[PDB]
Amino acid sequence: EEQKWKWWEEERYPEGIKWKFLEHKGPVFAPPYEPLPENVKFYYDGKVMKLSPKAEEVATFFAKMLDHEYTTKEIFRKNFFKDWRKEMTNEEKNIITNLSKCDFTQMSQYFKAQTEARKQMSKEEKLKIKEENEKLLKEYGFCIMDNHKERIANFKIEPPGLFRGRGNHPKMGMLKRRIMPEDIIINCSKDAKVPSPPPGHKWKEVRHDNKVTWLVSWTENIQGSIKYIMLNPSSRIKGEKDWQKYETARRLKKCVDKIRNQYREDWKSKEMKVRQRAVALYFIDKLALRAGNEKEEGETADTVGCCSLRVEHINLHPELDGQEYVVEFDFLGKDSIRYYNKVPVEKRVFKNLQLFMENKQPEDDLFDRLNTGILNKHLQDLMEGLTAKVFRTYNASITLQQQLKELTAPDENIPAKILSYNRANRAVAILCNHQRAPPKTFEKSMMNLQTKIDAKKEQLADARRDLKSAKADAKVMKDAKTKKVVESKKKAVQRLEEQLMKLEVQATDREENKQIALGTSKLNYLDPRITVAWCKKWGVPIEKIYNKTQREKFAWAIDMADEDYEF
DNA sequence: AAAAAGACTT
DNA sequence: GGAAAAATTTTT
DNA sequence: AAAAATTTTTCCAAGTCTTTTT
Ligand SMILES: O=C(O)CCCn1c2c(c3ccccc3c1=O)C(=O)c1ccccc1-2
């Protein structure tokens, strides 16, 4: 039965407390390892051998990745092998001395032949598995938190595999290791039925911590960090925190000018420490850069943010581009994605970066005397709850709002307005540096979308031919009588006019999303109310922008704030 | 403090 | 999330 | 149909800021 809870109209919980009641059926473990059949052989130095279950499982993972470029890299093969030997018996360790003499060319083909027979199942054996995954979602994918049933995001644990990560990770190849129930920590209420552990096992511990959001927790062997199973974005716990993110971003708008004037005068300060902080805060505001946390050497790939930049990442140019005082940025950020931008800065910012790069080696930190802790404690003394991450949400949302007013033409149709919406949502991705939407299939599919626009251009032309025939026959065979034909064929041209201005609009839309990714900005940086306030203003239906799960996530926006909403 | 953990976003 | 995969749905 | 374009699942990490230990 259709209910629909409006958690936004309820009262908030006092400091710390996230809930009072919590019950779940625990996580879902990856199905146990099924050993390779008799005809699938593994060869070492040409000779045949059958590996034990723990060592064969680690071999399968490598065999499945074998098509890739990374399996030829030295760090990958060093790491993989250290973790492979660990999972071997004493007999195998003595025979298998190197990865190079190991032949996986028969295991890499079985998993490619097992994929063919997986995508070519019968209608009864495919609908049997579709009902097996559906009963899991029904029994494990939901939980009860405070009088209401909310959906879980990651209810299943990730199966073991080989670590890869992004970029030139120093730990690529290491075994991700299987998570057993003895590594799992269950969080729930005292008065709630504690989930029964999978037969033959026991949990690590059951705790009742109402100060936290998570239902299940464990530790990953790669980094050593703690992984969690929290609720999907449609919930109160996640949605309330999402609303408070944009509310803190609204309170920044009201103090942004005072903050901009204070750091502009701070470039002229007597302390070198206060200069760096202001120049850092300038790049966080102008270029929308990440704070830049300090990460341990060898634990993750060499990536930087703002406070972590080095003298090798910036190149100063007094001339270049026709413009003066240009700072050429060239570095790798989060997820190892290249940030390259030649941007003109102000008089005092340039002569400051020259003082920061002075008599320093290329691997030294540009912003010494500065880390993320100093910058954030400074911002907290400027406004309550302010952090460098807010400047990203602010510069995103205020840009969406003003670009929605600048790019929307009132006299246009609804499909043409979505093109104007996507142009505004493009400007936010050309700020936060979000890139690439499948450019490999986008070469053939675009040229085959163009041949379907020309196929409807002929129908409009054949309609304009039939209306010109009616305008010429309304004269020789009189009006009123035989003029009703000029009426119905004038509405046929109109039905075909906006049908073409839909197809040609979806073409310009797809061609402009080449090296742009609308996703991360659409779901994490932009205030949904700005969009709902635009949809209710121009009569553009909400489903023609947000899909089911986005509408489900942003239900707090669709109900609250009308057309008169200003960020 | 200030590393290390932990708890969330992205 | 972004990309590859699988699941649908719409073209030929 | 049977292919092909779409849409929807599915695979898998890494930042930020806070809070505890040392
Ligand atoms: O599918 C799920 O139920 C897990 C969602 C978690 N989740 C994950 C990633 C992510 C990336 C960007 C925004 C949100 C998420 C997110 O919300 C990501 O890059 C990743 C790698 C490995 C495991 C999980 C994630």
**A158 CA, D11 C1': separation in Å?**
9
Active site residue A525: yes
Method used to solve the structure: X-ray
Listed in sequence order, the residues at least 6 apart from A14 whose beta carbon sits closer than 8 Å to its beta carbon are: none
Last residue of a domain, one of A233, A259, A276: A233
- Does A361 lie in the same domain as A372? yes
Please state, as a whole number, how many other Cβ atoms lie within 10 Å of the Cβ of residue A358. 8
Order of strands, sheet of A47-49, starting from the edge strand that comes earlier in the sequence: A47-49, A42-44, A102-103
Listed in sequence order, the residues at least 6 apart from A550 whose beta carbon sits closer than 8 Å to its beta carbon are: A522, A523
Alpha-carbon torsion (A533, A536, A541, A543), positive or negative: positive
CA separation for the pair A155, A473 (Å, rounded) = 70
Using alpha carbons, select from A228, A249, A225, A224 the residue that is nearest to residue A237: A228
Q: Strand, coil or helix: what is A179?
A: coil
* CB-strand contact A258/C, under 7 Å: no
The 3-class secondary structure across A319-333, one letter per residue, is CCCCCCCEEEEEEEC
Q: Strand, coil or helix: what is A188?
A: coil
Q: Phi, psi (5° rounding) for residue A432?
A: -85, -5
Documented resolution in Å: 3.0
Residue with tokens 């609804």: A414
Q: By CB neighbour count within 10 A (0-12 exposed, 13-18 middle, 19+ buried), where does A79 fall?
A: buried
- Does A395 lie in the same domain as A349? no
Contact A534, A425 (CB under 8 A): no
- Note down the domain range covering A112: 34-121
- Does A338 lie in the same domain as A200? no
- Ligand 1: nearest atom to the Cα of A154: 3
Residue with tokens 């899991």: A136
| C-alpha dist (Å) from residue A314 to A168, A235, A367, A381, A522 | 21, 43, 12, 30, 30
Q: Strand, coil or helix: what is A186?
A: strand
CA separation for the pair A22, A229 (Å, rounded) = 13
Last residue of a domain, one of A121, A152, A176: A121
Contact A8, A243 (CB under 8 A): yes
The CATH number of residue A5's host domain is 2.170.11.10
Torsion of CA A421, A427, A430, A434, to 10 degrees: -30
Last residue of a domain, one of A233, A252, A285: A233
DSSP secondary structure of A120-174: S--HHHHTTTTTTTHHHHHHTSEEEETTEEEEBS--BPPPP-B---SSS-TTTT-
Secondary structure letter of residue A342 according to DSSP? E
- Ligand 1: nearest atom to the Cα of A523: 13
Helix (H) or strand (E) holding A564: none
Q: Strand, coil or helix: what is A28?
A: strand
Contact A25, A151 (CB under 8 A): no
* CB-strand contact A434/B, under 7 Å: no
The CATH number of residue A65's host domain is 1.10.10.41
Q: Phi, psi (5° rounding) for residue A219?
A: -125, 135
- Does A272 lie in the same domain as A163? no
Contact A107, A35 (CB under 8 A): no
CA separation for the pair A329, A336 (Å, rounded) = 15
- Does A412 lie in the same domain as A462? yes
- Does A554 lie in the same domain as A541? yes
Q: Phi, psi (5° rounding) for residue A120?
A: -125, 50
- Does A253 lie in the same domain as A211? no
Question: What end-to-end distance do the CA atoms of chain A give, in Å?
Answer: 36
The 3-class secondary structure across A444-508, one letter per residue, is CCCCCCCCCCHHHHHHHHHHHHHHHHHHHHHHHCCCCCCCCHHHHCCHHHHHHHHHHHHHCHHHH
Listed in sequence order, the residues at least 6 apart from A527 whose beta carbon sits closer than 8 Å to its beta carbon are: A246, A249, A250, A397, A400, A557, A567
Q: Which residues partner with A207 through β-bridges?
A: A187
CA separation for the pair A28, A221 (Å, rounded) = 19
| C-alpha dist (Å) from residue A454 to A206, A462, A497, A505, A567 | 64, 13, 13, 13, 42
Q: Is the CB of A316 under 6 A from ligand 1?
A: no
Listed in sequence order, the residues at least 6 apart from A166 whose beta carbon sits closer than 8 Å to its beta carbon are: A301, A335, A336
Using alpha carbons, select from A360, A305, A370, A359 the residue that is nearest to residue A335: A305
DSSP secondary structure of A415-453: HHHHHHHHHHHHHTTTTTT-----TTTTTTTTTTTSTTT
Q: b/e for A113-125, b at 16 or more Cβ within 10 A?
A: eeeeeeeeeeeee
| Minimum-distance residue to C5 (CA–C1') | A119
CA separation for the pair A492, A486 (Å, rounded) = 10
Helix (H) or strand (E) holding A115: helix A107-116
- Does A279 lie in the same domain as A196? no
Residue A154 alpha carbon to ligand 1 centre in Å: 9
Residue with tokens 């007999």: A91
- Does A496 lie in the same domain as A557? yes
Helix (H) or strand (E) holding A24: strand A22-24
Q: Nearest 5°: CA angle at A526, between A528 and A424?
A: 100
* CB-strand contact A39/B, under 7 Å: no
| C-alpha dist (Å) from residue A435 to A396, A431, A519 | 16, 11, 10
Q: By CB neighbour count within 10 A (0-12 exposed, 13-18 middle, 19+ buried), where does A421 fall?
A: buried
Residue A357 alpha carbon to ligand 1 centre in Å: 38
Mutate to test the pocket of ligand 1, among A136, A140, A154 (most ligand atoms within 8 A of CB): A154
CA separation for the pair A473, A489 (Å, rounded) = 13
| C-alpha dist (Å) from residue A411 to A408, A503, A531, A542 | 9, 19, 19, 20
DSSP secondary structure of A215-230: SEEEE-TTT-PEEEE-
Using alpha carbons, select from A191, A217, A193, A192 the residue that is nearest to residue A204: A217
CA separation for the pair A193, A343 (Å, rounded) = 59
* CB-strand contact A100/B, under 7 Å: no
Q: Strand, coil or helix: what is A563?
A: coil
- Does A18 lie in the same domain as A147? yes
Q: Is the CB of A153 under 6 A from ligand 1?
A: yes
**A272 CA, C2 C1': separation in Å?**
41
- Does A91 lie in the same domain as A38? yes
- Does A547 lie in the same domain as A411? yes
- H helix runs in A175-271, sequence order: 236-253, 256-265
| Minimum-distance residue to B7 (CA–C1') | A212
CA separation for the pair A109, A42 (Å, rounded) = 12
The CATH number of residue A430's host domain is 1.10.132.10
The CATH number of residue A336's host domain is 3.90.15.10
Residue A520 alpha carbon to ligand 1 centre in Å: 11
CA separation for the pair A328, A314 (Å, rounded) = 6
The number of distinct structural domains making up chain A is 4
Using alpha carbons, select from A324, A237, A206 the residue that is nearest to residue A10: A237
Residue A530 alpha carbon to ligand 1 centre in Å: 25
What does chain A come to in residues?
567
Rg for chain A, CA atoms, rounded: 30
